[PDB]
Amino acid sequence: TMIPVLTSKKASELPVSEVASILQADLQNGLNKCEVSHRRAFHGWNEFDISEDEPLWKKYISQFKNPLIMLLLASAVISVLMHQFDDAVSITVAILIVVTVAFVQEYRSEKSLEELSKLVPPECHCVREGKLEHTLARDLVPGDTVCLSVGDRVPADLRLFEAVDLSIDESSLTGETTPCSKVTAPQPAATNGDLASRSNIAFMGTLVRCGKAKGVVIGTGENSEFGEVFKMMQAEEAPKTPLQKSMDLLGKQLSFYSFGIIGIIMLVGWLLGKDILEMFTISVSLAVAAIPEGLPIVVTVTLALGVMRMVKKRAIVKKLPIVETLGCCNVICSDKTGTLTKNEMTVTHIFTSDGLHAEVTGVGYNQFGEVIVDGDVVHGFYNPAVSRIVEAGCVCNDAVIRNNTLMGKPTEGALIALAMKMGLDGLQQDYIRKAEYPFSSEQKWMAVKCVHRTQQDRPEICFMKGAYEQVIKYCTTYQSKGQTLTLTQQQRDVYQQEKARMGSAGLRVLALASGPELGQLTFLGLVGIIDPPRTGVKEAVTTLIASGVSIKMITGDSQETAVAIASRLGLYSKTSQSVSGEEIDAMDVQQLSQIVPKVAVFYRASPRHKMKIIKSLQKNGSVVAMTGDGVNDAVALKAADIGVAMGQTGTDVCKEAADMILVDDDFQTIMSAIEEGKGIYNNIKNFVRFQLSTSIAALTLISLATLMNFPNPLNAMQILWINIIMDGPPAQSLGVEPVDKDVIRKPPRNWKDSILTKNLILKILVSSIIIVCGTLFVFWRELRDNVITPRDTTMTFTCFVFFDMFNALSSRSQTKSVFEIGLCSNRMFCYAVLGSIMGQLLVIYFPPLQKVFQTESLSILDLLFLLGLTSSVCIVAEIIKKVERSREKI
Ligand code: BEF
Ligand SMILES: [Ca+2]
Ligand SMILES: [Mg+2]
Numbered sequence: 048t049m050i051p052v053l054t055s056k057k058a059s060e061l062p063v064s065e066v067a068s069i070l071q072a073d074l075q076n077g078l079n080k081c082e083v084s085h086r087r088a089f090h091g092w093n094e095f096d097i098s099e100d101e102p103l104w105k106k107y108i109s110q111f112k113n114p115l116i117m118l119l120l121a122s123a124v125i126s127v128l129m130h131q132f133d134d135a136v137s138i139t140v141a142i143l144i145v146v147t148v149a150f151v152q153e154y155r156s157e158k159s160l161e162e163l164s165k166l167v168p169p170e171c172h173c174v175r176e177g178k179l180e181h182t183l184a185r186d187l188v189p190g191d192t193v194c195l196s197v198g199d200r201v202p203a204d205l206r207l208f209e210a211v212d213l214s215i216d217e218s219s220l221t222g223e224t225t226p227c228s229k230v231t232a233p234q235p236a237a238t239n240g241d242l243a244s245r246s247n248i249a250f251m252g253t254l255v256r257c258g259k260a261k262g263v264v265i266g267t268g269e270n271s272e273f274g275e276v277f278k279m280m281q282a283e284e285a286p287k288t289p290l291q292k293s294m295d296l297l298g299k300q301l302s303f304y305s306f307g308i309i310g311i312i313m314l315v316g317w318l319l320g321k322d323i324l325e326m327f328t329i330s331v332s333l334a335v336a337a338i339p340e341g342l343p344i345v346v347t348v349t350l351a352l353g354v355m356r357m358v359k360k361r362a363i364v365k366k367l368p369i370v371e372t373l374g375c376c377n378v379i380c381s382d383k384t385g386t387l388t389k390n391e392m393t394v395t396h397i398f399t400s401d402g403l404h405a406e407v408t409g410v411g412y413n414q415f416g417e418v419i420v421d422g423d424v425v426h427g428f429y430n431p432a433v434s435r436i437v438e439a440g441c442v443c444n445d446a447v448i449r450n451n452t453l454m455g456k457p458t459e460g461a462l463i464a465l466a467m468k469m470g471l472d473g474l475q476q477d478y479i480r481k482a483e484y485p486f487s488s489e490q491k492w493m494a495v496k497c498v499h500r501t502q503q504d505r506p507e508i509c510f511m512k513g514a515y516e517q518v519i520k521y522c523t524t525y526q527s528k529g530q531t532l533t534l535t536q537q538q539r540d541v542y543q544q545e546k547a548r549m550g551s552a553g554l555r556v557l558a559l560a561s562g563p564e565l566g567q568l569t570f571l572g573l574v575g576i577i578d579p580p581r582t583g584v585k586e587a588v589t590t591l592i593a594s595g596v597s598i599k600m601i602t603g604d605s606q607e608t609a610v611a612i613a614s615r616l617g618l619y620s621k622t623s624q625s626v627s628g629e630e631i632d633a634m635d636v637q638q639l640s641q642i643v644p645k646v647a648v649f650y651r652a653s654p655r656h657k658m659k660i661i662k663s664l665q666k667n668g669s670v671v672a673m674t675g676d677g678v679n680d681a682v683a684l685k686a687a688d689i690g691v692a693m694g695q696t697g698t699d700v701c702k703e704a705a706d707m708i709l710v711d712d713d714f715q716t717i718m719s720a721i722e723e724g725k726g727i728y729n730n731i732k733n734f735v736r737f738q739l740s741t742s743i744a745a746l747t748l749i750s751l752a753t754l755m756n757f758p759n760p761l762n763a764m765q766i767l768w769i770n771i772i773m774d775g776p777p778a779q780s781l782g783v784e785p786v787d788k789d790v791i792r793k794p795p796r797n798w799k800d801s802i803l804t805k806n807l808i809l810k811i812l813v814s815s816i817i818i819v820c821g822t823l824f825v826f827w828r829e830l831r832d833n834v835i836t837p838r839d840t841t842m843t844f845t846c847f848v849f850f851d852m853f854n855a856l857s858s859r860s861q862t863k864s865v866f867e868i869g870l871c872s873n874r875m876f877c878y879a880v881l882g883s884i885m886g887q888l889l890v891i892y893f894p895p896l897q898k899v900f901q902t903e904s905l906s907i908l909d910l911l912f913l914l915g916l917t918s919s920v921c922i923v924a925e926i927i928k929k930v931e932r933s934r935e936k937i
Contacts, residue, residue, distance in 0.1 A: 553611025
């Protein structure tokens with residue numbers, strides 16, 4: 048009927064009896080089908096939400112929610128209410144074409160090229176009516192009895208009542224590399240403050256390392272340790288991306304300036320005494336043209352292109368604004384347990400009793416790897432000492448690795464991987480174990496007795512593995528260069544010094560011995576077990592440091608491993624300092640601001656502490672790219688800027704928290720994202736420059752026409768066509784222009800800055816001045832003596848169109864010019880240029896088009912003269928750009 052959802056705190060406080068009776072849970076019979084169904088109906092399913100996928104309706108509707116779109120719609124309405132329908136129809140057709148093309152492209156391409164993000168369902172074991180039933184964890188109910196074995200994943204919060212040497216790896220939500228032993232007796236309230244201190248509870252999403260246990264589920268759904276994190280992350284209003292705010296501000300400023308200039312032009316015309324209707328129509332057309340109606344479309348196109356480029360490099364970006372925020376990052380955080388270093392112990396250094404030093408290459412529980420001693424490769428039984436050490440580590444073992452997954456203790460898995468690297472994966476099968484001494488905390492050693500299966504007549508050989516202090520007590524002799532010599536005090540001191548040196552580097556020293564009987568075994572050597580960083584981590588870190596981006600590391604694990612990992616990655620200096628989470632919480636934030644950017648190591652931290660660190664780093668002004676792979680980081684990933692979550696060794700919460708998903712865990716992918724973002728920003732800047740130059744030229748031409756009271760060189764239809772060309776498919780083609788190698792070697796962009804540079808403004812002004820001067824010269828040559836003809840208007844329109852095409856051609860690359868990118872790469876820009884040229888030709892040479900547009904036919908000689916005249920601006924622009932770049936670079 049009614050069951051309270053017991054938290055791990057209270058459940059840990061209480062014992063088995065009243066916890067079981069509170070939930071009406073039977074420890075042996077479990078729950079019946081009817082009770083399970085009722086609990087399912089009340090509490091719901093055990094799995095989390097699956098979010099909501101937006102259908103096409105409001106996805107297409109939202110494209111009309113831009114303020115510029117509202118302005119365009121209002122302008123079209125006022126145009127259709129003047130009983131003309133021409134400008135209204137043209138504007139409606141243009142906006143419909145642009146919006147439909149952008150919507151179909153984005154929706155279809157994103158829905159077709161983002162179907163590789165598939166997940167897998169979890170598994171669990173349940174007992175009902177005394178029968179062990181294999182059922183999914185997705186249907187679990189509170190009060191169920193769940194059996195825990197080696198290698199399985201804990202399905203929910205389990206109140207353990209029976210446990211036999213159970214070991215659970217909780218690094219997913221705590222970050223502690225060392226597994227914590229699990230007990231049955233309730234914990235005191237005084238020691239029940241920390242999450243890891245709960246040794247009598249089982250957390251969801253953790254992996255059982257060793258032992259077997261049975262527990263009763265206390266909380267299923269959104270009311271667990273994952274549930275509280277999800278509740279805290281529910282709203283979690285993230286800051287808006289800088290690109291969107293900057294684009295909105297630029298668009299608003301441009302619209303305000305255009306409206307002011309339109310009002311000034313209208314006032315001047317009213318004082319000049321001209322036709323109010325024609326002036327109003329021209330002002331409306333100019334207001335439509337000047338404001339950027341294609342800037343959001345080109346931004347969306349560039350973001351989609353970046354998403355596809357990321358996908359081609361095994362990445363997932365399930366939203367638009369992510370692509371243009373990684374390049375602005377100045378500081379990058381990283382979690383040691385899962386992102387920089389996997390949760391896998393691998394032997395790296397082996398010490399031999401005779402003084403030989405061995406280095407092991409390779410990571411992971413796989414046969415990949417190489418063992419090199421004195422610069423020579425050792426495989427199989429080539430080196431008797433290393434072979435004996437590997438045999439001791441493999442035969443005296445209890446863990447088995449199946450399908451690159453470890454079932455057993457991490458050190459045993461490291462030993463098995465080391466044996467696999469030399470090709471001795473099946474070495475344990477040649478010995479039949481007879482007597483076993485299980486490893487225990489008190490003894491701190493494990494010993495086994497075994498004989499060869501084909502050599503049973505051989506005397507029994509005992510292999511012992513454990514701590515150096517315990518193995519040396521049962522050791523009396525050692526092997527040196529194939530000779531058995533008595534172990535002396537000097538050799539013991541040398542071994543102790545070697546162990547201390549290994550420990551100073553963060554290596555976990557493990558001792559090995561072999562002999563016929565206990566108390567006589569022969570020392571073989573020491574093996575260094577340590578969690579190693581991923582192969583593609585050091586190079587990426589070095590590249591990021593050389594790029595001018597600071598890197599910080601948050602550990603959440605013991606201090607020694609933190610400093611060792613930081614030193615191995617080069618992020619820690621011997622003169623640097625680290626601060627714990629308790630000191631951060633106790634000490635006031637007002638002074639912590641000066642201490643947050645000078646440090647990069649945080650051995651002890653909490654999800655709320657990580658969020659506080661994130662907020663402090665962001666409050667002074669910066670963009671933070673913090674990664675993560677567990678629930679410990681999920682809230683920090685969500686409540687920050689762009690975050691990258693590993694999609695292989697990760698949880699179902701980090702994938703949703705972080706937009707960037709790597710199906711394969713790697714770090715070099717961030718550099719490609721930064722380069723693509725820089726290229727997208729360069730393309731956006733070039734498009735903005737071209738649009739601003741065209742708008743400024745048109746505004747200056749109209750102002751000059753209105754000022755000295757001479758007939759306007761262009762009508763409403765020509766201005767509308769110019770606007771369509773300026774902010775149409777040709778405009779969107781400027782953002783699809785391919786990337787280059789010049790902007791790649793550039794340091795992170797600094798925000799709170801204007802996108803218009805001095806050189807860009809000067810180039811825009813020069814282009815506008817040249818276009819206006821050419822148009823004025825053509826006009827003066829047209830109506831020179833006494834003639835006024837619509838052919839003059841057609842010539843002016845053609846000259847303006849040709850100038851726009853030439854400006855667009857030269858604006859494709861900000862630093863390159865013609866004959867540098869190839870010019871014949873089958874460009875959508877070239878296709879759009881050809882289409883616009885054919886449309887202009889059709890308009891010029893069609894009696895209906897000539898009637899509506901008030902134009903006239905031209906001649907071949909006139910076309911040749913126009914082509915030869917509308918080419919000076921591009922040549923001089925490219926020449927001045929080349930000479931300026933050469934003088935300022937060489
Ligand atoms: F070390 Be992290 F918190 F997984
Ligand atoms: Ca426009
Ligand atoms: Mg982690």
